[PDB]
Amino acid sequence: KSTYRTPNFDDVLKENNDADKGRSYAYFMVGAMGLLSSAGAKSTVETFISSMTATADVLAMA
Amino acid sequence: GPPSGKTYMGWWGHMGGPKQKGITSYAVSPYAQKPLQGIFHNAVFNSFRRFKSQFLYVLIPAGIYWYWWKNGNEYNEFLYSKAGREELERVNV
Amino acid sequence: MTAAEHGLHAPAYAWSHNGPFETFDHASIRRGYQVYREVCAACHSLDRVAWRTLVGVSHTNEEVRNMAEEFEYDDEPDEQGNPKKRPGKLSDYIPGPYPNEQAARAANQGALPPDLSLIVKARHGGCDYIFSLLTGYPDEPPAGVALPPGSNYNPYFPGGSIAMARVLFDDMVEYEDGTPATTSQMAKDVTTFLNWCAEPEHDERKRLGLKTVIILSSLYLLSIWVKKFKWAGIKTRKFVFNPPKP
Amino acid sequence: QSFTSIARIGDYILKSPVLSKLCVPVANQFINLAGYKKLGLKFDDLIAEENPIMQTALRRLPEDESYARAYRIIRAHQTELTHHLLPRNEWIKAQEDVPYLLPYILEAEAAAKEKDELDNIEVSK
Amino acid sequence: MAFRKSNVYLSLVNSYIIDSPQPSSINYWWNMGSLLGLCLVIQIVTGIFMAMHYSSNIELAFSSVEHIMRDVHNGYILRYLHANGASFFFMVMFMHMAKGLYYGSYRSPRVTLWNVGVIIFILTIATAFLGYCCVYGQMSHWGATVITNLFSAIPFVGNDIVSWLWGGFSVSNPTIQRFFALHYLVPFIIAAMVIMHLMALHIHGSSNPLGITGNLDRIPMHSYFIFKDLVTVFLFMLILALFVFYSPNTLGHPDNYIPGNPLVTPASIVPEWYLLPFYAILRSIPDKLLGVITMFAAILVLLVLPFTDRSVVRGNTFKVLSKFFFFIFVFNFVLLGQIGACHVEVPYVLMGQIATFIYFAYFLIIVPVISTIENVLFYIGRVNK
Amino acid sequence: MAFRKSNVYLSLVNSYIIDSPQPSSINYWWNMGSLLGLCLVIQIVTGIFMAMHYSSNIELAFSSVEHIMRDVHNGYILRYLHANGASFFFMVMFMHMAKGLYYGSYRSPRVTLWNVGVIIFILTIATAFLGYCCVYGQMSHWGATVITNLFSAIPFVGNDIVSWLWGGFSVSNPTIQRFFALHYLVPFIIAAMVIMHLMALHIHGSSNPLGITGNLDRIPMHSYFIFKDLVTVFLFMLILALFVFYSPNTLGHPDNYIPGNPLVTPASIVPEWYLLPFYAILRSIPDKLLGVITMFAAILVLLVLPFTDRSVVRGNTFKVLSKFFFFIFVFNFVLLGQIGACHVEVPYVLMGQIATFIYFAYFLIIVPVISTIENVLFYIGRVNK
Amino acid sequence: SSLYKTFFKRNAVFVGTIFAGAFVFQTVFDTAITSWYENHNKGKLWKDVKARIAA
Ligand SMILES: CCCCCCCCCCC(=O)OC[C@H](COP(=O)(O)OC[C@H](O)COP(=O)(O)OC[C@@H](COC(=O)CC)OC(=O)CCC)OC(=O)CCC
Ligand SMILES: CCCCCCCCCCC(=O)OC[C@H](COP(=O)(O)OC[C@H](O)COP(=O)(O)OC[C@@H](COC(=O)CC)OC(=O)CCC)OC(=O)CCC
Ligand SMILES: CCCCCCCCCCCCCCCCCC(=O)OC[C@H](COP(=O)(O)OCCN)OC(=O)CCCCCCCCCCCCC
Ligand SMILES: CCCCCCCCCCCCCCCCCC(=O)OC[C@H](COP(=O)(O)OCCN)OC(=O)CCCCCCCCCCCCC
Ligand code: HEM
Ligand code: HEM
Ligand code: HEM
Ligand code: HEM
Ligand code: HEM
Ligand SMILES: CCCCCCCCCCCCCCC(=O)O[C@H](COC(=O)CCCCCCCCCCCC)COP(=O)(O)O
Ligand SMILES: CCCCCCCCCCCCCCCCCC(=O)O[C@H](COC(=O)CCCCCC)COP(=O)(O)OCCN
Ligand SMILES: CCCCCCCCCCCCCC(=O)O[C@H](COC(=O)CCCCCCCCCCC)COP(=O)(O)O
Ligand SMILES: C/C=C(C)/C=C/C=C/[C@H](OC)[C@@H](C)[C@@H](OC)[C@@H](C)CCc1oc2c(O)c(OC)cc(OC)c2c(=O)c1C
Ligand SMILES: C/C=C(C)/C=C/C=C/[C@H](OC)[C@@H](C)[C@@H](OC)[C@@H](C)CCc1oc2c(O)c(OC)cc(OC)c2c(=O)c1C
Ligand SMILES: OC[C@H]1O[C@@](CO)(O[C@H]2O[C@H](CO)[C@@H](O)[C@H](O)[C@H]2O)[C@@H](O)[C@@H]1O
């Protein structure tokens, strides 16, 4: 078999209808994963930091 | 830097494998492939492949142990019921 | 282990707080406090519960303030060094009935009524067990069972022999909201109140759980899609061998 | 376990009509159930190589077979990573599942054994 | 060259997490290691933040955990994360170890990797023990009591070691305070041990599901595996979240919600689930000394596997008999755990004794016998004479 | 290859402690590093053992240290070693840093080495501060108050950070307990930084008193420097033992033998001796914010040395003007410390302000001017054109 | 998808936007969840019971 004859990738390739179909999907997916990871990270950092603030039992305004 | 020992793995450019000749490989950019739909086309279709090929190696020992457990569990239940106090006095002390 | 020793399994009642999306019924919490105060408090403490925690949950600031002010607490000694008392405040903890373990056992034939602040989490069965115990005292023990002088039979209690006698009887309390105070209704109410004592974070815990699980579920599916994309080139990589010429 | 030892026991069984009629069928069954042929590998491709005997053997293996081994290995990792099997027409057939490395392994093992014996010989004056 | 390769610090990050050559075919079972790293970090971070509101004094210990549950903002999240986190830490370590058993990861040249791992397992169990004691509930007191007494089985100096560990006449104030001190220490030793684990892993790289060389087709750690690990990181978090917020106490024991009492051992006493199999092993030997020895040997026997496996190939992928017995072993391990959760009663006692023998026989008999048989089977199933 | 070089773990020990090529001419000043390692180990070990008898509760802290002092066998030795050990740690660190300024150890290619060092210095100071707070004497309380309040200078979020560090209205229970938790944590962070420190040292090796290349004549770390370091180790232990057994409280403050009182700052309040120079710098500025900034800049300006040293040769060995001004710097630092122990009074206030100026002028003005001048002196003093 | 292109045009979303989006998401998501949660539990919350208890 000649190395110049590229094997069949038809079942994997998409018809050139929108070359950016995959890109946009991939970028939205990455973008959303990063958005939610950032929200999650901020919430986690805040959860720990806030646990160091005055506990419920020492806020007595006697 | 000091000389450390030889191992069976190296690094990029001298990994430690045999010389490779005659193999040609091809690949296509993920950006040029159908926006991932193989999650419910060749994953759910080809699903249970890893199942029906290996399940017996897991199911038989699983079944053997489950039966042994249920059998011993029921025997215990009987031994501690009114109907089993006679056999309980025997097998115990 | 014999059935008696095990104790009867407690059935699953439909607590309105059973379920990932359910808060406690606060009206039931409020009613439960009354049952605790009028029926249980005389023998059982609630040492880890501070008055201020009832506020915004089952009573208003005023209602709790007034409830607390009915009890005395050790104050700071006067200028001369003599001890002095003071009315309780929101920062104080619900006062117990006994000064020490000895006084408690004396008022209960040698037995010690445990603190109930964690009773719901300190027993297998949770609410179902507490409820079943409170409403599970038969009029007489089963035939053949000899009961230790001073004991009471309850199938749900391991061994069957418990130092606490049945205390819940129809209409021994008069609910403020006009609810018929039947034994089971009162049992349902205190158990709910006791669950709050043990898990005051319940409502808030579940709310954050919904948030956390939706974010992570999304994050999980997202990560799979992203992974498949970054691996697409490798997953479809093709190989061909052409035996080299010697 | 050394291949010399495996061969000694295996040859013994293979020469005995009684044992051979009893064991070989079970062994054939075992190899088909093993499934490595469905991945396109020959048994000798499965031998753990991180030891001096195998390194010696793989060094001595002729160029052409060495390139062939490399292909079967690479093709297998790829197939395995995709969670598929190769099409049947690419499966190694029983006729092809030949012990190509074995002779090199036995040779290397015998040399090391002799070297070990000679390193520890006693002398009788 | 790139700054990530030339910089003294970044080059370490680069070699272990970025350019590290991974076998192209390692499956999801190879994601357990990164997960154990997450666990350690989760455990340490949550522990430190809780440590800020905890009191080791035997009289304030239990209430200070209650103080974290009730008064500390997000305190119940910290505690449930820590407590449930410990459980997940063990479930993941069990899978990581099982992955090792199944794929012959313990085999040469990865013996040191395996041995350091056995070290980590022991430190992790000791750490978990010490942490549980700090709560000072009924299970804590009696667990501290039973486990410290394990050393009383050492002849002659046995009882002195126990008095030394206790720092008194029984588990008391000095015992809880040092246990908390030690609980804080060991996680840092484990981390040190993890680094050694990774150093051994690095000189040989990871193995693969085929059990053969990965040298012919490696793909960089960065991107492929950094993102593949993220998948399991999120699934681990999702499941831990399900337990933490929706079922935070199903993996624990209600008795630990009752303050420790030196005069009463609850009839309902049961060790933490992850310790149950070892507990069952010890309980199977009707002799004090022989009982502790066998239980400890149950962990140490993991060290003999590199020598009892006679197979000429690494891993169980192509071995029918080995695959079958591997699952017998796994299921025997679960049964040992279930036995541990039962009472010392007739059917269960014999079953435990039988399961205990099956546990040791796997490493000492079944593995070496079956592997030898498979070597011959692969040979006679093809070679002609 | 020798097993010490081939083994994955021993090869690290061998390259850092055995075969490491050391410049043949390094003198005893290069023995401070190993001494600092000894200090860290002394602090960690003595600390862990005391932690076993300590109670961070504000109501129990002071008494728990007294319990260690009276009731714990050899407990006074632990505390006196830990306490005096802290001071020695700082005296040896000051000499280690001074050694650096003198021999130009901060310059290329060792700036990363120096910067990590500055990081370690800060971490150690914070650790020592947290430790002092755990005794909860009169100095502990007020030290905690002043130092946490240092952050109230940050605009807008200032008072919020303080409230967060305190965990309440003032230095109280939540503060002492978290400070103990963090006191236990930072020393492990320092250990990790020390590894980064040693990593950066290793790729370039040590410098020498001649300030020139050591590549033409290296001698192995083992025997030579292993035994030379032993000399200073014993000396260090001898002097430290003298204080621990014969003068345990000379380096301390009597006021810290008095339980913390939230309503009374003693008129005799003085910071721990090793912090005095920095304290004097802060007092020299009649403005709150500028005071804390200048004090922090006093530590950060150490990072500027690699750029302000314009000299073409490394070290002061052959530099008359630099050698002189270096000692002006050392004694000025000592004086700043003396001013620190004095009351805010007339002669002292001006002296502190001028000394503070000299401290900064050294790095920003003196070094660059003097080094430039010497560059030209070395040139015209021989070049005949 | 043109919906994506109109906003980012073949470029991946930048950090700043990601972070900015995370801040908007926290507020909006919290409100939506609390809202759904409280409504699902109408009649059980203290604020609902406080309204009932008027005598
Ligand atoms: C109580 C405490 C528990 C804490 C532990 C939580 C983490 C669990 C880890 C699970 C694990 O290690 O299982 C590994 C096995 C091996 O699997 P394999 O041969 O490598 O995979 C081939 C993939 O489909 C390739 O496929 P893929 O393209 O990479 O996507 C795979 C799949 C991965 O899903 C996961 O999250 C992995 C478990 O994504 C999906 O399609 C799922 C959509 C809902 O995966 C299985 O077979 C799972 C059954 C055991
Ligand atoms: C302070 C509280 C905490 C600190 C406690 C630890 C103290 C250690 C720090 C001191 C230090 O680093 O001093 C370094 C200087 C520089 O010295 P050098 O130029 O390199 O030495 C040439 C050697 O004599 C060669 O000679 P040698 O053959 O190595 O023996 C040297 C000498 C070493 O003594 C020591 O203990 C080292 C300080 O032993 C003796 O003969 C005298 C015994 C008293 O040593 C000095 O002589 C100081 C000069 C001012
Ligand atoms: C001190 C010693 C401790 C050690 C004890 C062991 C730990 C306890 C066990 C916990 C779970 C571990 C399960 C086994 C570990 C994973 C096994 C594995 O690696 O399986 C790989 C296998 C199929 O993979 P293959 O690569 O071989 O497929 C061939 C492709 N050509 O995949 C399969 O066959 C499918 C996997 C089936 C898993 C079912 C596990 C059942 C576990 C019970 C759960 C416990 C809860 C009570
Ligand atoms: C944040 C800021 C950090 C910096 C703070 C600095 C604080 C000061 C540190 C305290 C001790 C000072 C250590 C002195 C610094 C190193 C001294 C040194 O290296 O001196 C070398 C010098 C001669 O050495 P040569 O290598 O140049 O000899 C070449 C022969 N051809 O040999 C000499 O000069 C003789 C030795 C001089 C002894 C030092 C005396 C000063 C002692 C201070 C007393 C402490 C008071 C409590
Ligand atoms: C409705 C109000 C009450 C509630 C909710 C309640 C609840 C409980 C519960 C849950 C237990 C734990 C049993 C166990 O170990 O599982 C208990 C024990 C006990 N209670 Fe009560 N109780 C109430 C009223 C009383 C009264 C009025 C008294 C005192 C006369 C009393 C005396 C005791 C005693 C002595 C025990 C010990 C049981 C034993 O160990 O045998 N209780 N109670
Ligand atoms: C804190 C616990 C541990 C950590 C962080 C850890 C981490 C890791 C990591 C990151 C890997 C590489 C990826 C993988 O295969 O998952 C690995 C591999 C390995 N670990 Fe661990 N490990 C731990 C405990 C253990 C234990 C207890 C054992 C054994 C008793 C063990 C045995 C192994 C082996 C044998 C490998 C190589 C697997 C292979 O490549 O086939 N590890 N570990
Ligand atoms: C490998 C890491 C760790 C493991 C496996 C571990 C495990 C445990 C376990 C099993 C418990 C009892 C859980 C319960 O039922 O409540 C516990 C408690 C505790 N741990 Fe850890 N721990 C780890 C690290 C840490 C660290 C580094 C600290 C100290 C800074 C810490 C501080 C505590 C505290 C304060 C408690 C008491 C509060 C509680 O009950 O959760 N832990 N730990
Ligand atoms: C716990 C803290 C520290 C430890 C354990 C440590 C340890 C060491 C060691 C073992 C050496 C080699 C031998 C020697 O020169 O004494 C060294 C060199 C060095 N260290 Fe440190 N160090 C510490 C802190 C610092 C600090 C605070 C600085 C500077 C602000 C620093 C600056 C240096 C420099 C510049 C060198 C190279 C000196 C030369 O070769 O000329 N170190 N250190
Ligand atoms: C490695 C650097 C360390 C330094 C510089 C250091 C420094 C200090 C200082 C200045 C004090 C006050 C001494 C006094 O006047 O009484 C102190 C106290 C204390 N430190 Fe550390 N420490 C270190 C590490 C540790 C570690 C790892 C622990 C472990 C928990 C620890 C535990 C304690 C305890 C319990 C006290 C209070 C008892 C006492 O006064 O000695 N320290 N530390
Ligand atoms: C102790 C071990 C704990 C965790 C082990 C897990 C290992 C994975 C770490 C993930 C880092 C991802 C960085 C990707 C990167 O830099 O590539 C950057 C791209 O990064 C992105 O697109 C950001 C996507 C959002 C990342 C999600 C954060 C993960 C949540 C953290 C949870 C972990 C505790 C290079 O991109 P480019 O190659 O296309 O030019
Ligand atoms: C924060 C950590 C900083 C960095 C950590 C690395 C520092 C290393 C300091 C440790 C010095 C102790 C090394 C002793 C190990 C030497 C022997 C050895 O490695 O034998 C190993 C086996 O070791 C084990 O089974 C146990 C590991 C010991 C765990 C120690 C806690 C043999 O390995 P070998 O090098 O001989 O491999 C080739 C032979 N086919
Ligand atoms: C240090 C790692 C600890 C994280 C362990 C994760 C296990 C699941 C429980 C997480 C809950 C903690 C906070 C919480 O309750 O938030 C909840 C939201 O949680 C999430 O979104 C969790 C997803 C996790 C993403 C984490 C990214 C990685 C961490 C980076 C840290 C720099 C509630 O949020 P909230 O307080 O309402 O603002
Ligand atoms: C200062 C540090 C010290 C003393 C460290 C000691 C470490 C010991 C071992 O770790 C290496 C040990 C934890 C490990 O044994 C190998 C476990 C499997 C022990 C398993 C174990 O648990 C129990 C438990 O949890 C209980 O709870 C209420 C009660 C128990 O009996 C009633 C047991 C028990 O009978 C056993 C065998
Ligand atoms: C959770 C951890 C936290 C909040 C850590 C904070 C760390 C801050 C800094 O470390 C980097 C800080 C310790 C360091 O500043 C650079 C020192 C030189 C501060 C010097 C210092 O000491 C004093 C002291 O010791 C006292 O004792 C009785 C009393 C003091 O006034 C009366 C002072 C004082 O006026 C100053 C400036
Ligand atoms: O404390 C109650 C008291 O009642 C006795 C009377 O003989 O027991 C009978 O009555 C109890 C209350 O109705 C039952 O709980 C008990 O089961 C029944 O036998 C005493 O035994 C007991 O001390």
Identify whether residues C132 and C98 lie together within a single domain.
yes
Task: Output the ligand 12 site: residues, CB below 6 A.
Answer: A 37, 40-41, 43-45, 47; C 208, 211-212, 215-216; E 41-42, 45, 77, 237, 240-241, 244
Parent domain of D125: 1-125
H helix and E strand count, chain B:
2, 1
CATH number of the domain residue C207 falls in? 1.20.5.100
B61:E327 CB<8 A: yes
Q: Give dist(CA F56, CA F135) in Å, integer.
A: 9
Per the listing, tokens 């305004």 go with A61
Identify whether residues C146 and C29 lie together within a single domain.
yes
Which residues fall within 8 angstroms of residue D91, CB to CB, at 6 or more apart? Answer: D37, D38, D40
Residues 338..367 of E with a Cβ closer than 8 Å to B: which? 338, 342, 345-348, 351
Residue A61 in domain: no
Which ligand 14 atom sits nearest the alpha carbon of residue F270?
Answer: 28
Q: Domain residues of chain G, as ranges?
A: 1-55
Q: Give dist(CA F99, CA F95) in Å, integer.
A: 6
Domains defined for chain B, CATH in brackets? 1-93 (1.20.5.210)
Closest residue CA from atom 4 of ligand 13? E148
If DSSP codes are grouped into helix, strand and coil, which group holds residue E148?
helix
Parent domain of C14: 4-200
In chain A, the number of structural domains is: 1
Check if E332 contacts B (Cβ < 8 Å). yes
Q: Give dist(CA C246, CA C243) in Å, integer.
A: 9
Which chain D residue shows the shortest CA-CA distance from E27? D81
From the list E87, E99, E141, E228, the catalytic residue is E228
Q: Give dist(CA E147, CA E152) in Å, integer.
A: 10
Which residues fall within 8 angstroms of residue G16, CB to CB, at 6 or more apart? Answer: none
Closest Cα partner for B33 from A7, C233, D79?
Answer: C233
Q: How far is C53 from chain E (nearest CA, A)?
A: 10
DSSP chain D: --HHHHHHHHHHHHH-HHHHHHHHHHHHHHHHHH-GGGGT--GGGGS---SHHHHHHHHHS-HHHHHHHHHHHHHHHHHHHTT----GGGSPPTTT---SSHHHHHHHHHHHHHHHHHHT-----
Both tokens of C11, joined, read: 């059935």
Angle made by CA atoms G30, G31, G37, in degrees to the nearest 5: 90
Angle made by CA atoms F113, F119, F123, in degrees to the nearest 5: 140
E260 class by beta-carbon count within 10 Å (0-12 exposed, 13-18 middle, 19+ buried)? buried
Q: Would you say B45 and D83 are in contact if contact means Cβ atoms under 8 Å apart?
A: no
Give the Å distances, CA to CA, from F213 to E70, F23, F109, F208, F216: 64, 9, 12, 8, 7
Both tokens of G27, joined, read: 């507020």
Closest Cα partner for D44 from E138, C171, E378?
Answer: E378
Task: For domain F1-385, give its CATH number from 3.40.50.1580, 1.20.1250.20, 1.10.3720.10, 1.20.810.10.
Answer: 1.20.810.10
CB under 8 A, 24+ apart: contacts of E227-231: E227/C223, E227/C226, E227/C227, E227/C230, E227/C231, E228/C227, E228/C231, E228/E28, E228/E31, E229/E31, E229/E34, E230/C223, E230/C226, E230/C227, E231/C220, E231/C223, E231/C224, E231/C227, E231/E31
Residue C171 identity (one-letter amino acid): D
Q: What is the resolution of this structure in A?
A: 2.5
Instruction: Give the largest CA-CA distance in chain G.
Output: 64
D3-12: string of b/e by CB count within 10 Å (b at 16+)?
beebbebbee
Both tokens of C39, joined, read: 């029926």
* Alpha-carbon torsion, ordered E9, E14, E15, E17, to 10 deg: 120
Which chain A residue shows the shortest CA-CA distance from B34? A14
Q: Give dist(CA E354, CA E91) in Å, integer.
A: 24
DSSP A18-45: -TTHHHHHHHHHHHHHHHHHHHHHHHHH
Q: Which of E307, E309, E383, E384 to mutate to test the interface with D (most CBs of D within 10 A)?
A: E383
Say how many Å lie between the CA of residue E44 and the centre of ligand 11.
25
CATH number of the domain residue D76 falls in? 1.10.1090.10
Q: Which of A2, A4, A11 to mutate to test the interface with B (most CBs of B within 10 A)?
A: A11
Give the Å distances, CA to CA, from E121 to E102, E110, F347: 18, 17, 65
From the list E255, E272, E309, E374, the catalytic residue is E272
Per the listing, tokens 């994309």 go with C229
Q: Count of CB atoms within 10 A of residue F276's CB? A: 20
Experimentally, how was this structure solved?
X-ray
Q: Would you say E199 and F8 are in contact if contact means Cβ atoms under 8 Å apart?
A: yes
Closest Cα partner for G38 from C203, C28, C205, C211?
Answer: C203
> Which residue numbers of A have CB closer than 8 Å to B's CBs?
3, 6-7, 9, 12-14, 19, 21-23, 25-26
If DSSP codes are grouped into helix, strand and coil, which group holds residue F62?
helix
Residue A16 in domain: yes
> Which residue numbers of E have CB closer than 8 Å to C's CBs?
24, 63, 66, 69-70, 76-77, 219, 223-224, 227-228, 230-231, 233-235, 237-238, 241-242, 244-246, 248-249, 254-255, 257-258, 267-268, 343, 345
DSSP C59-89: B-HHHHHHHHTTSEEE----TTS---EEE--
Q: Would you say F191 and F37 are in contact if contact means Cβ atoms under 8 Å apart?
A: no
B15:E21 CB<8 A: yes
DSSP structure class, residue E183: H
Identify whether residues C49 and C101 lie together within a single domain.
yes
Residue F367 identity (one-letter amino acid): V
Closest Cα partner for C76 from C68, C91, C86?
Answer: C86
Residue A41 in domain: yes
Which residues fall within 8 angstroms of residue E290, CB to CB, at 6 or more apart? Answer: none
* Alpha-carbon torsion, ordered F269, F275, F279, F282, to 10 deg: -150
Name the helix (H) or strand (E) containing B26: strand B23-26
C43 is in an annotated binding site: yes
DSSP structure class, residue F58: T
Q: Domain residues of chain E, as ranges?
A: 1-385
Name the helix (H) or strand (E) containing F288: helix F288-300
Q: Any idea how long chain E is?
A: 385
Which residues fall within 8 angstroms of residue C67, CB to CB, at 6 or more apart? Answer: C51, C54, C59
Q: What are the backbone angles phi and psi of residue C161, rounded to the nearest 5°?
A: -100, 105
H runs (alpha helix) in G1-55? 2-8, 15-40, 46-52
Which chain A residue shows the shortest CA-CA distance from G27? A39
User: Can you say how many angstroms the Cα of residue G27 is from the centroid of all Cα atoms in its chain?
Assistant: 6
Q: What are the backbone angles phi and psi of residue A35, rounded to the nearest 5°?
A: -70, -50
Q: Would you say C2 and B80 are in contact if contact means Cβ atoms under 8 Å apart?
A: yes
Which ligand 9 atom sits nearest the alpha carbon of residue F82?
Answer: 41
Both tokens of C101, joined, read: 């373990």
Q: The domain G1-55 belongs to what CATH superfamily?
A: Cytochrome b-c1 complex subunit 9 (1.20.5.260)
**Three-class SS string for E313-344?**
CCCCCCCHHHHHHHHHHHHHHHHHHHHHCCCC
Both tokens of E283, joined, read: 């309980």
DSSP structure class, residue C96: P
CATH number of the domain residue A32 falls in? 1.20.5.270
Q: Count of CB atoms within 10 A of residue F186's CB? A: 17
Cis peptide bond prior to D25, omega within 30° of 0 = no
Q: Would you say E98 and E329 are in contact if contact means Cβ atoms under 8 Å apart?
A: no
Q: Give dist(CA E76, CA E66) in Å, integer.
A: 9
Closest residue CA from atom 44 of ligand 3? E334
Both tokens of D8, joined, read: 């000694």
Angle E320-340/E276-283 helices, nearest 10 degrees?
80
Q: Is the dihedral of CA E257, E262, E267, E272 positive or negative?
A: positive
Cis peptide bond prior to F109, omega within 30° of 0 = yes
Q: Is the dihedral of CA E217, E221, E223, E228 positive or negative?
A: positive
Parent domain of A33: 1-55
Instruction: Give the largest CA-CA distance in chain A.
Output: 90
Identify whether residues C40 and C67 lie together within a single domain.
yes
Q: Would you say E58 and E257 are in contact if contact means Cβ atoms under 8 Å apart?
A: no
Name the helix (H) or strand (E) containing E219: strand E218-220
Q: Give dist(CA F34, CA A27) in Å, integer.
A: 52
Per the listing, tokens 């800060």 go with F122
